[PDB]
Amino acid sequence: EVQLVESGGGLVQPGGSLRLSCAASGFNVVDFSLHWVRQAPGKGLEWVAYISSSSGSTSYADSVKGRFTISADTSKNTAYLQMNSLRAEDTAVYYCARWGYWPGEPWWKAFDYWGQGTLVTVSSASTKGPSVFPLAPSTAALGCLVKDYFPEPVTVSWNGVHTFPAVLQSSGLYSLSSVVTVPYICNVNHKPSNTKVDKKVEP
Amino acid sequence: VTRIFLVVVYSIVCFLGILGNGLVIIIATFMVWFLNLAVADFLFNVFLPIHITYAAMVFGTAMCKISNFLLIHNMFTSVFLLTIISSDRCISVLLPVWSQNHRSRLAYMACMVIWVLAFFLSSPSLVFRDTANLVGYSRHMVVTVTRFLCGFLVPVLIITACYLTIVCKLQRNARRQLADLEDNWETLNDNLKVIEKADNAAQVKDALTKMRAAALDAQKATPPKLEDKSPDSPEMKDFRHGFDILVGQIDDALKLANEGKVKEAQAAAEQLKTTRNAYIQKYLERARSKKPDKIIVTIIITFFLCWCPYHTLNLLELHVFSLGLPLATALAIANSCMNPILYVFMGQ
Amino acid sequence: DIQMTQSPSSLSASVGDRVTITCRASQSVSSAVAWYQQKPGKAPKLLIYSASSLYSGVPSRFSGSRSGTDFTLTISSLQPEDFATYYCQQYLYYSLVTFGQGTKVEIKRTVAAPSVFIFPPSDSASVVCLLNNFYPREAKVQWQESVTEQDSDSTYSLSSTLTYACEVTHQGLSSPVTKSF
Secondary structure (H helix, E strand, O other): OOEEEOOOOOEEOOOOOEEEOOEEEOOOOOOOEEEEEEEOOOOOEEEEEEEOOOOOOOOOOOOOOOOOEEOOEOOOOEOOEEEOOOOOOOOEEEEEEEEOOOOOHHHHOOOOOOOOOEEEEEOOOOOOOOOOEEEOOOOEEEEEEEEOOOOOOOEEEEOOEEEOOOOOOOOOOOEEEEEEEEOOEEEEEEOOOOEOOEEEOOO | OHHHHHHHHHHHHHHHHHHHHHHHHHHHHOOHHHHHHHHHHHHHHHOOOOOOOOOOOOOOOOOOOOHHHHHHHHHHHHHHHHHHHHHHHHHHHOOHHHHOOOOOOHHHHHHHHHHHHHOOOOHHHOOOOOOOOOOOOOOOOOOOHHHHHHHHHHHHHHHHHHHHHHHHHHHHHHHHHHHHHHHHHHHHHHHHHHHHOOOOHHHHHHHHHHHHHHHHHHHHOOOOOOOOOOOOOHHHHHHHHHHHHHHHHHHHHHHHHHOOOOHHHHHHHHHHHHHHHHHHHHHHHOOOOOOOOOOHHHHHHHHHHHHHHHHHOOOOOOOOOOOOOHHHHHHHHHHHHHHHHHHHHHHO | OOOEEOOOOEEOOOOOOOEEEEEEEOOOOOOOEEEEEEOOOOOOEEEEEOOOOOOOOOOOOEEEEOOOOEEEEEEOOOOOOOOOEEEEEEOOOOOOOOEOOOEEEOOOOOOOOOEEEEEOOOOOOOEEEEEEOEOOOOEEEEOOOEEOOOOOOOOEOEEOOEOOEEEEEEOOOOOOEEEEO
């Protein structure tokens, strides 16, 4: 069946280079063009660039013209998207779409077999373990807070518990909170920085 | 003399009529409303030879005649069936998907109701009332006010507005098609001169984007003439493929204008002009070209033009020049004799 | 190069309701738009193509119409599984694809009283104003904030942050409540 695979997504220094490989088994890249659509975190989808390996007619979006360099190889059934002079406002989840060829039905069907999409993030800060701060209670809501961690992946395991989405700070780091509506210990799992510090919360 | 003219009336009416009467029934067995016409015309044509109407030079037909029962039956059947056909055509023109929605046993009950609608004024008027049957003009108690009102006013008025709305709806459909194609034609022509006078790729890409959007829209729209054929017909596929290449020439012209060079974009647009006028323009030149595909208008026109004069002499006399008697049977016999030729002409 | 707009960018329909989403294309665009349903944390999936047809495998509840240069998507029923973000996308050429802002569909619920908790700062300064089990999103705390996704009894839980008293206003509260430490 049709199946698209992306890779190469991860931490990138502002001004560095990246390469995303849109592996697509099943169909052939010659048969269908491959459009790259990116979605900034918390915003709508945005078009970036397209490649049609049958003839070659690359044409990127206005904002990314020249910086990017899309390519496709039929021998590997892939459509790479070279990244050059990457900025801090280009962080998003890059999907790899498909599209038919005029004339007939395939053209009238829009981007249908989207890929999974691998996120690319750009920041000027390194990776540091969270500094869990015990949070006293006031029912009595109980929880604990973490600060100054990177990158995105982190989770809090307790022992009605909430875990609000991470919000980016003006200093380039993150901050996440949690609370359980108790009418206890705090665990944080940060795989990139392998920190498992335990925090004790008590009135 | 008078006997010779009357004698040949029955032979002309029956022999010619009965030849097509069975043929119409056989053809219909092998058009639900037309089946009624072949049936209804056959009933009073079969009983016509029983009294050849030549017993006027035999003092017969004491409790029978071709006039009262049979002519009332014939007039009622013709009027009711014509009204039903006109209403069906008007409904079909004016979006029948709500009134009927292809629900034509439901039409069989209505088809058999023509005699039921006939059996309220035609057979119910079975009485002498100083009719022919072998002061005013037969207006002491048989003034035929109801016969004229239902026979003429009811059928003519229903039919007249029915095709008037049918042709009106047809014009609005066709009108909604020529204007759309003309609008799509206008934007194709208007945007083409801008490209031929293009200075940079900033505008030659924008002009082509509008012309591509018009070609896609025009492909969905039906052509003004040469229409009504099946969507899978070769001519429809020939027209649709005519725009699958025009858009293909747009993509080739627009793709070469995306790279940055524009001197080549006009040449690709120029070769679009030579194929758009040779084939598409020729197609619409023969396009933008009335009457129904059958002879239903012909039979309806003939009947109303031959039986209205029959009742014209009914009340023409007022309380001498009584020439409406010899032509009385001839006028109605012609319509019955015109029934099978019209059916044959409709089949062609 | 064209601009595509969707006025109803936040819908609060309930189960079994009908949702109508409008989409207007600035330039002359033929019946060449599409609608995608993006479940959270997943790739978008095509729902309607060519503005009238249906993709092979979509439930029959999704239907769309054109009615001029505008475009519309109508949903007959709202099953619990069908609750995600819907995007309106046009396509005229390969290089002229523009996506709509996006329509989000959430779970309707009656107004509820927000609960506000003020957390004294840790000894190891930063305090957080907590909102727990409140609906709907139309609540603003006044002294960097982040709300959770819709919980699965269809309620939210806002959380403020400051680097004292925090107060929360809401249509479910007759008057704002102030908590101080």
